[PDB]
Design a protein around this nucleic acid. Structure first.
Ligand SMILES: [Mn+2]
Ligand SMILES: [Mn+2]
Lengths: 302, 929, 295, 165, 295
DNA sequence: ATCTTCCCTATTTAAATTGCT
DNA sequence: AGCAATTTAAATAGGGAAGAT
């Protein structure tokens, strides 16, 4: 007993998405993909900072980025490849006095549901935060091992039953429970309207710097890989007072709301893995949450 | 349990208490109930009989003793239920009550004459500095002294004369000097910086003539001429007749004032000052509204002009007169007759039947309870208090947790919260986890109780929760600092609440040896003040030194002389009750206390010595104490272990010493399985509390429940390196201890932490005393001053413990009980006794215990500071993030057995160690790195 | 009500007769036709039985049930021969502790565990005899009582069914009834309908032990529909199974002494309060039924 | 005047106020606020709130506006039409910053650029701290911030739900 | 006054208020407030209730219990009962627990029927939501509420353990709380300690739900110590489990309407008992417990 | 009906004073 | 000093009416 957790214990990320490159298409002209360019407009304004009152007279020529659709294409296309990898129970930096006990404590994990919610967050449009808002038509095409799947009307908040997501979830759960990998090429086509302004992900700027950096690969608007990884693991409906699916965190913590849902109420990942290697009976939902964290990965040492 | 409740009440307060008392007992008719109920039923009946309102007139009888008496019902002195009680019972030569009335009335009509200067008027209106150059009490004293020098101050018309700046206002007339000291010290006492005056002044006026304006009143002094130009708008109808009637009252009674003794005058003027602040704060708290303008005294919360000075003086007078009347004519509310006390003690509590050798009708009692630990000392103290009748006492104890332990004993034996009041004035966040419903512990702060009649004379109806628990408690289980302020304070009215508390209640001070020397001086001052009003002092200390027991008896004897000559009764002596676990002895002692006390001490020593030796201590020869600790740990594990598992206590002196011993033992390569704990006091709220509860549940050896809190399967050395926080108030039982020597009472107390719960005698040696303290390598001139009575005035000639202690010795209380003044420079015990008789002496000095003449001054509260510590700033941990220069560090992780983490709380760092980083750590708290 | 006297620590018990029970000024009080209003300590009452000619309002039941007082009526099936339905209202507004129901029904459903529990409660009869001795009647240590207790234990040890149990009851009770009667020099036939004091005091003590047993049951949450003894003449449920632990130890010696020492109904009632609170019989039955369920 | 509620729900992934602003934009672009439907917000303390409240005098039904906000249905909630005798009506307040009025001084007074800087150099630069929304304007191709504050009730409203004059 | 409550099929739970129940000319009657006597037919009633202002007498109690009319004492309204005895198979002929009670016990014991009955109690809670449609409350057929209903249905059907059912039950209950908060324009978070109108109105409505569920559990003889969802140490957990069926369907919309219009507590009590009388909510719970226990 | 609150209602206790022995 | 007569007054008990559930 009293199997104390290793200080070096970490797990690798098992859902690896690429950067979500963003293109402009039409709804019936889906093959002509023109890359959405981040424009950048200059704004003239004096600097106002707390530490330098002497520098407020002149300076701060700032040039803020923006990204709209072109005025001939009404559909935004978002392309990214989500790579699910198996052996989520292998610790990369941990070892096997604790990670092997985790293997033999989370073998009864229903990966079917875990994978369903992953592919449902892929398909329903959780990966399209501010640009699925106000779109009159949502479409998702998933290409997986030469199989094409079409999704039109999936409400993203609840994980309802559709056999299309389920079909992919099968091979995704077979990867995640076993050994190997699977790759889902996900292209989202959302009809926002003619010249509607799109929403790339944001680089962190300083309190000063410029107003807003949109995410650029080679000049073209895109969204962060870790931001999509936040979308995919947004499956946590099993904490106490669970209203909406949150991103599976080791503490159940969302930064933008200023509260942590699983911290400080004995449902955090660390107490559940210590309970697993000390062998108390877990329910299915918290064990699924622990396996979702191990799929997410991260260093758990102290 | 069969009780009978009778009602004396008028009103429908004979009706709405009848619903509750008829909910729990059967009605026998004629407003009398009688029946069987449980003790918790008695508690529920008390709680819903007192809370129902004011005017409840309820007497309860369990068998034939009175259970409780709601209100000031006279009820039973001999028989119960009187007939009509009307008026005019005794009407004596009260004399000293008329003296206190005259002094308080004359001073209270003159206490705020000095607010009439123009500086106080613009201070209240707010166009100058709110701090006066000279305080208004001194200006009123200057007014009264100038009027006394000019006209005959006792029988004349008043008229305020032209006053100037006077450095001293105290003359020779003893009664005038009393009125002047009451006027000047109605806010704060004068403080005398003068060393020759502090050296020599003893008498009442002869010390009072040294109280000048420079002792706190003369703040800065640039607007003195405006501070002494005064208007005379007080000459009205009711003020002049009130002044005339009180002055003539004093005139008629001051003939008995010169027949008093010094001790009387000091205690009577202390009572007068307490009643004067009671009346002044009572009238300053409430808002009267009406005013006659042109002159003002106080300000409201909005800063508007209120309480004009004529009616302010009249209100302070009547409130102080009423304060005096209720504090001098109170039959105070006492506790319930606890039925789980009065039966026989069985087995190891069988000495508690010594109360059947004490007289139940003695007006005074000085108990010296020299019984050893584990015998139920506090239960015996409650038994001794209940032997004289119903209980009214203040259990003043050191530490919060010891008050919690005595409260839990009081709760589970027989005492509910209608009689008990646990007071810890810090609101600590140490909560009980695991199960709130299945706790059956964690004594809390509610006090259903009963509000006393003294709350109406305090400011703004006493206070909220805390002072209601203070004043109105029958039994007040409190930390001691809520009682030592009775002897007096620097600034404010914080003296009155413990003063009026200790006036009508007994005082029970347990383990007074753990206090400091100045702490024990002010505790014996409190004992003298408690004995000044006929209450009984129970001292409960096993390792008492004759010096301490003597000076506490002399304080009680001076107090009982005050009480005897105050009620015009001839002083027969003090009923001293020597008590231990082997017997009791009650003697009427007016003189020769020393031979009787030493004979009882020798009898207790002979009753301790034929018992088997439980603590055999060997002083090691190894000079270096680090490897002495190593070798002693190895030897006492190889000799004293319970099947391979042994518990050791490394008692060291200070915190960096503790972390040095810990960091050496963690890096110490040995075949022994050392598991190290740090147990000093510098720890965060959470971490510290966690250590406490764990240690209390693993070192409990009365049963084998600990086998499940530690790994006793594998042979392991469970070592706790601790500072003097382990030798005070800890119910710990170690297999053996290694002691760094600081004082001999530390040796006796850490012997009391070894085999505390077991009865098996050691074979070879269970204590290994280190050769030197660790301060020898840092300061060879003085090394025992930290947590010891060595000092700069009392230096040991040699620091070798072969020279100053026995090499093989059975450590018990005998060396502390005996008392030796000779050869104090080369033995630790005689060094201890020397200091104890040279600081707690039968003199008045200035920081002494018989203090007379200086009670009038602020000197015993400035130069004798209770809990005199270092500056002490508090670095606070807020959610894992430290406040000041802390820098969390990482411990050695070699042998730590248990380490609890902390996130909130605070650490107490001396200002000396604030310069550098205290470097807080999860394992050991504060150090120098 | 603060903590409220534990129901084992309530000492007052009443069976009111020919009165109107009501609430005056918040007082549970019974008023007779002579204009006399006697209060009841409702926060200390164990039970209030109601005899013939009695009546009680709603509010009196409301503040008796809030204070945990069991109220029964001595008529209906209260002729005590069939002992079918003594009308006994319990305070179930208070949500009782549950674990004694769980261990009780685990042993109830299991018939072998029910048989063993019945044997334990039958041994509680002789345990009660030994624990609660009386100094005005039969000595428990004489040869007849020791012989019949030994015969009862050796019969209940080798017992196989509840029909065999029903018979052992016949023996113990009937012969203890008789043994007292021969020592009290009275030809006695137990009859609930008989007029002699030896039977009216016995029926009054039957109602008193009914109230004690039902209060001990309800305290733990145990009902009455789960009895341990099943038989043709054992209609009445678990309250009589708990109550006949203390007939021959308490109720029967007090009733026989009362009749022989010419006590009145009121003083027999009081002698019953004195024995039920001096030896603390309610806490005895409550702790012993905790021993019965346990696991 | 009878009124209807449009409460933004489950907008944590996207700010609540972005959904509120998109609700305003979709209510603008598909008609709704012709001249008589107005908006109000029960929870303006420092944020604009999460409830849009439409108090049209003729009566707003659930069906027309739920067909209008078919795009926000994933994170919207519509209450049944209730009544209110008094609604707390807000209006539009706009900000000007330097060059704005400079171009006005180009086109109204006809003065040159340097003297237009000269008359306005030490002036202007007001800063509105009122609660606001962020609006896509479609006729003028740039996105801006619109400030709302409490004013006396007006009979006529704009195409956005705020008071006129 | 005189109040009729249909409970199972044909027997009626009579509620009597401000009346004195006694025996006139050999049969049970009661004098009412208006000074007019009303008799009671023995054939059509089994449960008779005594509300506020009501007194019963001893021979009326005995004759009511001898006719199979088993009496209970309740707070005025008929759904806040504090005193009764336990239903048997017959009141006079024998003493056996009811078939419903025994069935419940057996179902609770074997782990599979306990899990199936926990799933079923939540199935009928969703049924209750639709069945009892209010006017002021949210539409049960609305897309968000139906999505919450189907989420709860999927979660209950796919669960194999009780703590999963507790998480799903809490999600459904507080999701309906969130939906009703979205209706009534407020930030509502369920806490018992808050003094706002919505929380304290929901609290006292929940206490009314506990009372009517306690009456429904008593009326089939179901004991208060066999909870389905809640733990074995929860005192009276079966009352909470049965009241859960109508807490989010009836108590929640009535409480939110009551806090929206802001009327006082007694008229919320009369609205709750009016909804209980009009739609036969107690009869719904009685049939619910029969279908649960019969299986 | 039951019970509570309050207003009469005067009936009912306790104190107060003071010659008288 | 105890008491008696005798006033004076504060309070206790009860009944009726009205308002709650
Ligand atoms: Mn003053
Ligand atoms: Mn003053």
């Amino acid at each position: 007993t009293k199997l104390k957790a290793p200080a070096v214990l970490a797990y690798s990320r098992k859902i690896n998405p690429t950067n979500a490159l963003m293109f402009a298409v039409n709804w019936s002209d889906r093959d002509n993909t023109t890359a959405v360019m981040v424009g950048t407009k200059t704004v003239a304004g004096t600097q106002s900072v707390r530490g330098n009152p002497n520098d407020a007279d002149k300076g701060n020529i700032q040039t803020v980025n923006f990204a709209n659709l072109p005025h001939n294409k009404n559909t935004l296309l978002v392309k990214y490849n989500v790579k699910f990898v198996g052996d989520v129970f292998k610790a990369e930096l941990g070892g096997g006095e604790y990670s092997n006990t985790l293997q033999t404590a989370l073998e009864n994990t229903d990966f079917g549901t875990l994978a369903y919610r992953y592919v449902y967050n892929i398909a329903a449009g959780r990966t399209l935060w501010r640009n699925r808002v106000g779109a009159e038509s949502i479409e998702t095409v998933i290409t997986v091992n030469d199989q094409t799947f079409t999704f039109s009307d999936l409400l993203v908040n609840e994980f309802d039953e559709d056999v299309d997501v389920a079909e992919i979830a099968d091979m995704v759960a077979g990867v995640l429970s076993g050994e190997g990998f699977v790759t889902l090429k996900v292209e989202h086509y959302m009809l926002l309207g003619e010249g509607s302004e799109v929403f790339p992900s944001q680089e962190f700027v300083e309190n000063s710097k410029l107003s807003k950096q949109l995410f650029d690969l080679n000049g073209q608007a895109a969204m962060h890989d870790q931001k999509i990884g936040n979308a995919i693991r947004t499956i946590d409906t099993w904490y106490e007072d669970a209203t909406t699916p949150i991103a599976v965190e080791p503490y159940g913590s969302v930064v933008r709301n200023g509260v942590a849902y699983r911290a400080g109420n004995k449902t955090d990942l660390f107490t559940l893995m210590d309970g697993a290697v000390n062998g108390k009976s877990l329910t299915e939902e918290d064990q699924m949450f622990v396996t979702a964290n191990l799929i997410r990965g991260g260093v758990f040492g102290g | 349990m069969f009780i009978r409740i009778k009602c004396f009440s008028k009103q429908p307060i004979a009706k709405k208490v009848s619903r509750e008392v008829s909910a729990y007992l059967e009605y026998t008719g004629n407003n009398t109930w009688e029946g069987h109920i449980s003790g918790q039923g008695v508690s529920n009946l008390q709680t819903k009989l007192i809370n129902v309102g004011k005017g409840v007139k309820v007497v309860c009888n369990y068998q034939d003793k009175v259970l409780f008496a709601i209100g000031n019902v006279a009820m039973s002195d001999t028989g119960s239920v009187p007939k009509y009680t009307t008026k005019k019972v005794y009407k004596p030569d009260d004399s000293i009550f008329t003296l206190k009335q005259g002094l308080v009335g004359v001073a209270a009509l003159w206490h705020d004459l000095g607010k009439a200067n123009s500086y106080f008027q613009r201070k209240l209106r707010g166009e100058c500095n709110p701090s006066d150059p000279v305080r208004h009490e001194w200006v009123s004293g200057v007014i009264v002294s100038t009027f006394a020098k000019g006209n005959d101050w006792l029988s004349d018309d008043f008229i305020i004369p032209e006053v100037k700046h006077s450095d001293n206002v105290f003359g020779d007339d003893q009664v005038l000097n009393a009125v002047l000291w009451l006027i000047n010290t109605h806010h704060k006492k004068g403080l005398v910086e003068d060393p020759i005056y502090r050296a020599t002044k003893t008498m009442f006026t002869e010390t009072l003539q040294c109280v000048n304006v420079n002792g706190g009143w003369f703040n800065y002094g640039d607007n003195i001429d405006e501070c002494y130009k005064i208007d005379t708008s007080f000459i009205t109808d009711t003020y002049v007749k009130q002044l005339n009637r009180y002055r003539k009252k004093l005139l008629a009674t001051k003939h008995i004032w010169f027949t008093l003794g010094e001790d009387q005058k000091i205690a009577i003027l202390q009572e007068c000052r307490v009643a004067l602040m009671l009346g002044d704060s009572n009238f300053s708290s409430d808002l009267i509204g009406g005013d006659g303008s042109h002159l003002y005294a106080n300000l409201d919360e909005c800063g508007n002009l209120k309480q004009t000075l004529t009616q302010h003086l009249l209100g302070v007078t009547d409130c102080a007169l009423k304060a005096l009347f209720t504090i001098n004519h109170h039959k105070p509310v006492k506790a319930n007759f606890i039925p789980t006390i009065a039966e026989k003690g069985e087995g190891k509590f069988a000495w508690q039947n010594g109360v059947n050798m004490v007289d139940s009708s003695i007006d005074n009692m000085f108990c010296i309870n020299m019984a050893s630990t584990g015998k139920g000392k506090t239960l015996a103290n409650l038994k001794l208090l209940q032997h004289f009748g119903n209980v009214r006492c203040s259990f003043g104890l050191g530490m919060v947790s010891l008050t919690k332990q005595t409260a839990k004993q009081f709760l589970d034996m027989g005492v509910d919260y209608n009689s008990a009041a646990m007071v810890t004035g810090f609101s600590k966040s140490r909560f009980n986890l695991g199960s709130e419903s299945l706790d059956q512990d964690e004594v809390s702060v509610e006090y259903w109780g009963q509000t006393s009649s003294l709350s109406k004379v305090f400011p703004n109806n006493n206070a909220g929760f805390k002072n209601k628990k203070l004043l109105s408690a029958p039994i007040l289980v409190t930390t001691t600092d809520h009682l030592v302020k009775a002897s007096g304070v620097k600034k404010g009215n914080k003296q009155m609440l413990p003063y009026v508390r200790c006036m009508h209640s007994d005082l029970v001070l347990d383990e007074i040896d753990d206090y400091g020397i100045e702490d024990m001086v002010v505790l014996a001052r409190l004992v003298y003040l408690t004995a000044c009003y006929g209450n009984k002092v129970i001292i409960s200390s096993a390792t008492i030194t004759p010096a301490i027991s003597n000076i506490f008896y002399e304080a009680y004897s001076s107090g009982y002389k005050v009480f005897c000559a105050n009620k015009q009764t001839t002083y027969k002596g003090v009923n001293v009750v020597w008590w231990d676990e082997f017997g009791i002895k009650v003697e009427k002692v007016t003189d020769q206390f020393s031979n009787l006390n030493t004979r009882f001490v020798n009898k207790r020593i002979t009753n301790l010595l034929e018992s088997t030796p439980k603590h055999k201590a060997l002083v090691v020869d190894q000079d270096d104490n680090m490897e002495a600790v190593k070798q002693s740990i190895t030897t006492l594990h190889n000799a004293h272990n319970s099947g391979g598992v042994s518990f050791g206590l490394i008692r060291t002196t200070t915190i960096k010493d503790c972390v040095a011993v810990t960091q050496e033992l963690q890096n110490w390569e040995t075949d022994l399985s050392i598991k190290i704990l740090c147990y000093h006091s510098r720890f965060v709220g959470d971490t510290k509390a966690q250590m406490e509860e764990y240690l209390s549940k693993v070192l409990n050896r009365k049963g084998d429940e600990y086998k499940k809190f530690v790994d006793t399967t594998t042979p392991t050395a469970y070592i706790v390196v601790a500072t003097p926080v382990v030798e005070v108030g800890r119910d710990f039982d170690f297999d053996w201890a290694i002691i760094e020597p600081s004082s001999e009472r530390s040796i006796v107390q850490c012997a009391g932490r070894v085999l505390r719960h077991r009865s098996s005698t050691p074979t070879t040696h269970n204590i290994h005393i280190l050769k030197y303290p660790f301060k020898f390598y840092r300061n060879s001139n003085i090394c025992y001053d930290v947590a010891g009575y060595e000092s700069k005035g009392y230096k040991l000639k040699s620091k070798n413990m072969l020279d100053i202690y026995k090499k093989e010795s059975i450590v018990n209380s005998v060396n502390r009980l005996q008392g030796d003044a000779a050869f104090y420079t080369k033995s630790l015990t005689a060094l201890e006794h020397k200091v104890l008789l040279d600081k707690l002496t039968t003199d008045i000095a200035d920081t002494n215990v018989f203090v007379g003449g200086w009670q009038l001054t602020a000197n015993p509260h400035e130069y004798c500071k209770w809990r005199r510590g270092t500056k002490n700033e508090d670095l606070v941990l807020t959610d894992g993030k430290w406040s000041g220069n802390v820098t969390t560090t990482k411990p050695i992780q070699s042998k730590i057995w248990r380490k609890w983490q902390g996130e909130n709380g605070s650490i107490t760092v001396p200002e000396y160690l604030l310069d550098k980083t205290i470097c807080y750590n999860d394992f050991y708290g504060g150090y120098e790195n | 009500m603060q903590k409220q006297i534990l129901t084992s620590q309530k000492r007052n018990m009443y069976i009111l007769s020919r009165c109107k029970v009501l609430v005056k000024n918040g007082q549970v009080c019974h008023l007779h036709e002579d204009g006399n209003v006697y209060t009841v300590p409702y926060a200390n009452t164990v039970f209030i039985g109601l005899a013939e000619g009695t009546s009680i309002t709603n509010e009196a039941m409301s503040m008796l049930a809030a204070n945990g007082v069991i109220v029964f009526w001595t008529k209906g099936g209260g002729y005590d021969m069939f002992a079918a339905d003594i009308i006994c209202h319990l305070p179930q507004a208070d949500y009782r502790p549950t674990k004694y129901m769980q261990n009780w029904v685990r042993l109830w459903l299991d018939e072998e565990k029910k048989l063993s529990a019945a044997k334990e409660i039958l041994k509680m009869r002789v345990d009660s005899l030994s624990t609660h001795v009386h100094d005005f009647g039969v000595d428990v240590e004489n040869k007849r009582v020791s012989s019949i207790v030994n015969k009862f234990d050796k019969g209940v040890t080798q017992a196989t069914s509840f029909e065999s149990l029903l018979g052992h009851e016949g023996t113990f009770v009937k012969s203890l009834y008789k043994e007292y009667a021969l020592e009290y020099e009275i030809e006695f036939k137990r009859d609930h309908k008989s007029a002699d004091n030896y039977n009216k005091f016995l029926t009054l003590g039957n109602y008193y032990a009914y109230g004690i047993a039902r209060s001990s049951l309800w305290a733990l949450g145990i009902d009455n529909s789960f009895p341990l003894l099943h038989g043709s003449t054992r209609r009445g449920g678990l309250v009589f199974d708990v109550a006949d632990i203390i007939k021959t130890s308490i109720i029967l010696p007090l009733a026989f002494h009362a009749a022989d020492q010419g006590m009145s109904n009121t003083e027999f009632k009081r002698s019953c309060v004195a024995y039920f609170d001096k030896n603390d019989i309610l806490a005895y039955l409550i702790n012993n039924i905790k021993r019965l369920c346990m696991e | 005047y009878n009124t209807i509620s449009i409460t933004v729900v489950d907008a944590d992934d996207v700010g609540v106020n972005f959904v509120v602003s998109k609700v305003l934009s979709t209510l603008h672009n598909k008609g709704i606020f012709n001249g008589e439907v107005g908006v109000t917000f029960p929870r303006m303390d420092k944020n604009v709130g999460d409830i849009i409240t439409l108090f049209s005098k003729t009566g707003v039904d659930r069906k027309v506006l739920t067909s209008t906000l078919n795009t926000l249905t994933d994170f919207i909630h519509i209450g049944k039409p209730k009544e209110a005798d008094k609604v707390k009506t807000y209006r539009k307040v706009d900000t000007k910053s330097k060059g704005k009025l400079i171009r006005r001084c180009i086109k109204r007074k006809g003065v040159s650029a340097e003297t237009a800087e000269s008359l306005y150099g030490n002036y202007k630069g007001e800063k509105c701290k009122l609660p606001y929304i962020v609006v896509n304007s479609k006729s003028t191709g740039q996105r801006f911030s619109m400030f709302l504050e409490e004013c006396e009730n007006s009979e006529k409203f704009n195409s956005y739900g705020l008071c006129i004059v």
